[PDB]
Design a protein around this ligand. Structure first.
Ligand SMILES: *[C@@H]1O[C@H](CO)[C@@H](O)[C@H](O)[C@H]1NC(C)=O
Ligand SMILES: *[C@@H]1O[C@H](CO)[C@@H](O)[C@H](O)[C@H]1NC(C)=O
Ligand SMILES: *[C@@H]1O[C@H](CO)[C@@H](O)[C@H](O)[C@H]1NC(C)=O
Ligand SMILES: *[C@@H]1O[C@H](CO)[C@@H](O)[C@H](O)[C@H]1NC(C)=O
Ligand SMILES: *[C@@H]1O[C@H](CO)[C@@H](O)[C@H](O)[C@H]1NC(C)=O
Ligand SMILES: *[C@@H]1O[C@H](CO)[C@@H](O)[C@H](O)[C@H]1NC(C)=O
Ligand SMILES: *[C@@H]1O[C@H](CO)[C@@H](O)[C@H](O)[C@H]1NC(C)=O
Ligand SMILES: *[C@@H]1O[C@H](CO)[C@@H](O)[C@H](O)[C@H]1NC(C)=O
Lengths: 512, 508
């Protein structure tokens, strides 16, 4: 509640994370790649009419050729009445016209079908629609719904083609029953229930399931990963994403273990979905906010951004000194051929209270990234201090400087963030957490020493952290006072002698 | 030698006189002596975790008044220590230590981890004087797996398989290992269990039969502690609900649930020889900052003892799930200095509930049942909070905050206190948790209940009738302690109706 027609974009609006022009966004929808058009598609839960979640609810639509530059198009799908809306869903490409929508020169791999939840008063169903113009306008299928279970709580279909069972698989969730329901079809129109899956952190409801085959990093081997979103049960706060690793025959998913693991342990990574028609590799992004405060954050005339797209692999990594576990790794996309305004490189800098690392750029795009590999040296240091931190500071406007903090404590072998900013108040802080997480284990040892790596990227209201080589991800929005945005970056310590040796430091000012 | 006890030291939570404490150990009840026993990981020589490590020892007759006794078990060398373990009562002398008039149910055996350089083993010891001095068994260790990471035995007698069961953890393998014995001396590996939130290591497992609230039915619960993997921060406790035949534990589902979603509830252990009901307590701190908190000449307290039951409760509007319920003990016959009762209070900014007690024991409790009324209120405000304030010393007042937001149907805490700094804050979280679902509906309205107890550095919250617990330590500036309690709102008209409010100043 700050409105007027005050537009915060200048200091708030991310530059390379997608953002709608005006209005409210949540779950990403119908993510696919168009092969012939060489084009990435982003759809999303969209309310254009308010800056919060809205009763007549649509699929918004953007395209990109590189996953950092977006064009906003007209609404893709709308509801029959203001009475409710077009909830989350996915898209597939029906190359072989198994659904029977094909004028005759509707290009294969441009033969586009959307599967989504249709939200009516007292009823949620799975409906389908098809696009003949490349995914810009859609036609709803005469005989919708394609699945109706007489339920008020049954949503978020993610479908994909699965060979060697020779069927379309739908992964949808019966939310309050805590079941991911797996359906089959040779048709996209007629569906059959194959199995029910229930595990991990229950919270309040199951939402937005995913099921996809992810490669193991070195081998030609892979595993199937079940993605599941829960809200409002998150042990961390409101909303969160989790995953399971195992097998899949087209009928039931069978996990390798019964352990719970989260995709991202930041506060702001929810409703994760994967992209369709990606050849070699797995790609996906999420809604980059948390349901407990997402509609109160001081941005206008929009709310919400998407996260960066991420490349998903599986890697055996040490969860403790002795073990190793096949772990979900994620790393950010970035075209490289993004603008580097200018940068700062240094090598094996032995960091002290006497020589901090400071950016000296002149001018500031809101957007920066920092990439560090470091060694923990043998040195006795008093329990506190604050074992090395990287500080992201604003311009010095209004006789104060706003800053967020990202550090690593070597006694706790843990990374941490502190997104607390003074004098910024908004409804439902209390749930806006400030201090977070992240225990790791060395990325490597080089001479019995302990080596870690860090990659972070700050847009304008959003910071994404990738610890080791994407072993764990931490996404968080941060706010900063009216007019202020990130201007420079320091790396500091209270230690007199060097405890941390930064083998490599690269700090970059980036631009659109 | 500044002593912070006057404003920091809990009054009814156990605390060692001097030195450092962590995991609670060898919890048992003595039937003939009518006495509760508390042992613990103890380093007397420093105010942090210490190389020569002992089992400390306290007794109580009511679980809120404690006598500190001499060390119960010590290690052979300063080189290491006596790690976590449990106690059982060998009524029928299956171990063969019995002069002849060593009373049954006073026939006491301690099972513990012996930490040596490069070696952790399970050893046993017996007490003939009522659990005050111990003798180590000649042929220790009772179990040795040639491991550096193998600890925290919890043992109990299990009929209908007719054996002693040991629940111990092979920490870095992520296995709770289940052993059997007719002996307490000779053990056989029966099964391995691996589930829930892995984190870094498995620690302090538990296995016990817990009643379902109304029926004569019950379930078996596996307790498991992990650190430093906790999704919330450092250390945390989790549980599983299922069956047990004496050989393998088989859970009803494969879901992860935590025992307490505060930052400071770890190494939970259950009491032995409790007839009807299940009782236990935990180390009331978090491993990432536990040795840096501003208290002297001690660090760490135990939590209150809790009564543990299982109840079918709504996790969402539609469902219900057999959930672990916990509630605090408190003798009732604790000193109530004075109190404040109110009924049917329709809260507004113009009707703030305030304590007016005169004088302050550090210790208070508050018990509230409330309705969320039908009323449009602007998104913010701060839907009703309860504020715990200090004395007004040094021209400032320190306070922690416990509230409930009706739009988010969630309770929350904010333990942030200005100007108090100590090593490794960064991990000291401040704002926490707690989504619930109504305890009841009375006329399509939504009813919740809250019970909280503040000692002097520790606050324990129990939402609904113990559906979820939230334990957190809080700190407050030099000299300051809780003095009074307010319940406030920013709403002009009443959004919350407090059906019942009881605020009490308590004492030893
Ligand atoms: C919602 O937004 C769309 C803009 O595309 C508009 O056509 C419609 O009238 C709006 N509805 C309401 C109820 O504001
Ligand atoms: C599907 O179409 C592709 C060519 O577009 C072809 O290679 C494949 O064999 C077809 N499968 C079926 C079942 O028609
Ligand atoms: C799957 O879930 C539904 C949910 O109500 C249930 O009725 C059905 O029996 C389940 N089917 C299988 C095959 O487990
Ligand atoms: C993702 O990474 C894999 C190899 O790790 C590679 O084949 C692919 O090019 C990447 N995909 C994208 C879109 O960058
Ligand atoms: C960080 O830099 C290293 C160069 O040492 C490179 O391998 C890597 O691609 C960078 N990581 C990310 C996530 O951009
Ligand atoms: C249990 O665990 C140990 C690993 O520590 C392993 O050697 C053994 O095979 C397992 N035994 C059973 C019966 O599962
Ligand atoms: C704990 O609760 C049980 C009911 O499950 C009751 O019978 C028992 O006496 C209680 N014990 C204590 C110490 O409060
Ligand atoms: C709180 O108060 C209610 C009476 O309204 C009572 O039933 C309950 O025993 C109390 N709970 C605790 C934990 O003191």
């Amino acid at each position: 509640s700050i409105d007027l027609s005050v537009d915060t974009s200048e200091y708030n609006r991310p530059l390379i994370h997608f953002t709608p022009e005006k209005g409210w966004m949540n779950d990403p929808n119908g993510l696919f790649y168009d092969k012939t058009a060489k084009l990435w598609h982003l759809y999303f839960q969209y309310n254009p009419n308010a800056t919060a979640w809205g009763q007549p609810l649509y699929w918004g639509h953007a395209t990109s050729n590189d996953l950092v530059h977006w064009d906003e198009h007209e609404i893709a799908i709308g509801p029959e009445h203001d009475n409710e809306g077009i909830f989350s869903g996915s898209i597939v490409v029906d190359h072989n016209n198994t659904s029977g929508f094909f004028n005759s020169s509707i290009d294969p791999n441009q033969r586009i079908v959307a599967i989504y939840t249709n939200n009516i008063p007292d009823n949620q169903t799975q409906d389908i629609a098809f696009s003949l113009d490349g995914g810009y306008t859609f036609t709803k299928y005469e005989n919708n719904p394609v699945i109706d279970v007489s339920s008020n709580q049954f949503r978020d279909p993610k479908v994909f083609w699965h060979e060697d069972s020779n069927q379309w698989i739908m992964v949808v969730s019966k939310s309050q029953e805590y079941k991911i329901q797996i359906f089959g079809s040779a048709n996209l129109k007629n569906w059959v229930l194959n199995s029910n899956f229930s595990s991990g952190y229950y919270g309040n409801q199951y939402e937005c399931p995913g099921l996809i085959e992810v490669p193991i990093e070195n081998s030609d081997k892979s595993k199937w990963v079940m993605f599941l979103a829960i809200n409002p049960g998150s042990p961390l706060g409101g909303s969160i994403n989790q995953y399971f690793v195992g097998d899949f025959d087209g009928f039931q998913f069978v996990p390798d273990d019964s352990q719970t693991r989260f995709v991202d342990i930041g506060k702001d990574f929810y409703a994760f979905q994967t992209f369709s028609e990606v050849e070699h590799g797995v790609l996906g992004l999420a809604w980059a906010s948390n349901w407990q405060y997402a509609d109160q954050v001081p941005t206008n005339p929009w709310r919400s951004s998407t996260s960066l797209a991420r490349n998903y692999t599986l890697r055996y990594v040490h969860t403790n000194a002795e073990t190793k576990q096949l772990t979900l790794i994620q790393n950010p996309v970035l075209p490289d051929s993004i603008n580097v305004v200018d940068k700062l490189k240094k090598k094996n800098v032995k960091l002290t209270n006497k020589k901090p690392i400071k950016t000296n750029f002149k001018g500031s795009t809101g957007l920066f990234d920092f990439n560090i590999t470091f060694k923990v040296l043998n040195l006795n240091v008093s329990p506190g201090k604050t074992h090395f931190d990287i500080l992201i500071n604003s311009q010095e406007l209004n006789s104060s400087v706003d800053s967020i903090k990202i550090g690593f404590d070597s006694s706790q072998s843990s990374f941490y963030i502190d997104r607390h900013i003074p004098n910024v108040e908004f409804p439902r802080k209390q749930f806006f957490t400030d201090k977070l997480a992240a225990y790791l284990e060395p990325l490597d040892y080089d001479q019995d020493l302990r080596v870690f790596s860090l990659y972070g990227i700050v847009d304008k209201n959003i910071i994404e952290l990738y610890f080791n080589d994407g072993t764990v991800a931490m996404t968080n929005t941060f706010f900063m006072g009216e007019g202020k945005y990130p201007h420079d970056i320091q790396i500091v310590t209270d230690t007199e002698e060097p405890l941390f040796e930064l083998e490599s430091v690269i700090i970059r000012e980036l631009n659109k």
